[PDB]
Design a binder for this molecule. Structure first.
Ligand SMILES: O=C(O)/C=C/c1cccc(OCc2cccc(CC(=O)O)c2)c1
Ligand code: NA
Ligand SMILES: [Zn+2]
Length: 258
């Protein structure tokens, strides 16, 4: 599987190997803020990252993943639209070549410079691989990034990217606190969707925060120095690793806030 983000292997090609690309609950989507409806039934959202145990950061040729020890209930997401407990397994970002693009979700068609995905799996299914086979297997917390003031909690990530420039490189990344990547408000939109990369499985409850975080131009410029290619291969900058908005079809986006 040689999927990627280029002209010949990018999102418009994915459906040939992954026909669910044209399915009924694909992600990302445009969030039309005027059509999203407040749902007074949503329970409070609970992000409990105090005992999070990061392990490693990996360039997988598509993005970089900060991985967590998910062998115990440490860092979990509960409440909101969710039933039960979802354990953090990894986070990663999608970003652009320019500050005007990079996010996967859009808000009233606005693209942000980047989008953070904190990926969690439903502990009722025992492991991530079983969870992705279920319609309620994953919860992905999505957070927009805009360019402005630096995000101090991001800088440790930024500073290790030089050591994982190319596809397949990993580095120790212990003691990283993902609480430093969250905005002040947990107001959110939620809808049922999919993974935004192959295999595009329709197993995700999306929770997209309304408040973006700000990162500096210098921080995102360092994301853009990463490579899609492996070591010793021709350089292809890791930029524009985002899937565009997909048809909403038979879905409603719910808001947690008035
Ligand atoms: O290597 C293989 O053959 C199968 C890989 C595989 C098999 C099953 C699942 C799966 O999920 C990958 C994943 C995890 C989290 C998020 C996303 C989409 C995104 O970039 O936001 C994709 C990957
Ligand atoms: Na717009
Ligand atoms: Zn993602």
């Amino acid at each position: 599987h040689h999927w990627g983000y280029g002209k010949h292997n990018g999102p418009e090609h994915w459906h040939k190997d992954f026909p669910i690309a044209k399915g009924e609950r694909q992600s990302p989507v445009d969030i039309d803020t005027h059509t999203a409806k407040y749902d007074p039934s949503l329970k409070p959202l609970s992000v409990s990252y105090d005992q999070a145990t990061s392990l490693r950061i990996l360039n997988n040729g598509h993005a970089f993943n900060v991985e967590f020890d998910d062998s115990q209930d440490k860092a979990v997401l509960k409440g909101g639209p969710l039933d039960g407990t979802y354990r953090l397994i990894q986070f990663h970002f999608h970003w652009g070549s320019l500050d005007g693009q990079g996010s996967e979700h859009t808000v009233d068609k606005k693209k942000y410079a980047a989008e953070l995905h904190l990926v969690h799996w439903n502990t009722k299914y025992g492991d991530f691989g079983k969870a992705v086979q279920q319609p309620d297997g994953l919860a992905v917390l999505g957070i927009f990034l805009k360019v402005g003031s630096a995000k101090p909690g991001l800088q440790k990530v930024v500073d290790v990217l030089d050591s994982i420039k190319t596809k397949g490189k990993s580095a120790d990344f212990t003691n990283f606190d993902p609480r430093g990547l969250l905005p002040e408000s947990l107001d959110y939109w939620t809808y049922p969707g999919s993974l935004t990369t192959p295999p595009l499985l329709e197993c995700v409850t999306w929770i997209v925060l309304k408040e973006p975080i700000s990162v500096s131009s210098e921080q995102v410029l360092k994301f853009r120095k990463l490579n899609f290619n492996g070591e010793g291969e021709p350089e292809e900058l890791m930029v524009d690793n985002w899937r565009p908005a997909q048809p909403l079809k038979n879905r409603q986006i719910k808001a947690s806030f008035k």
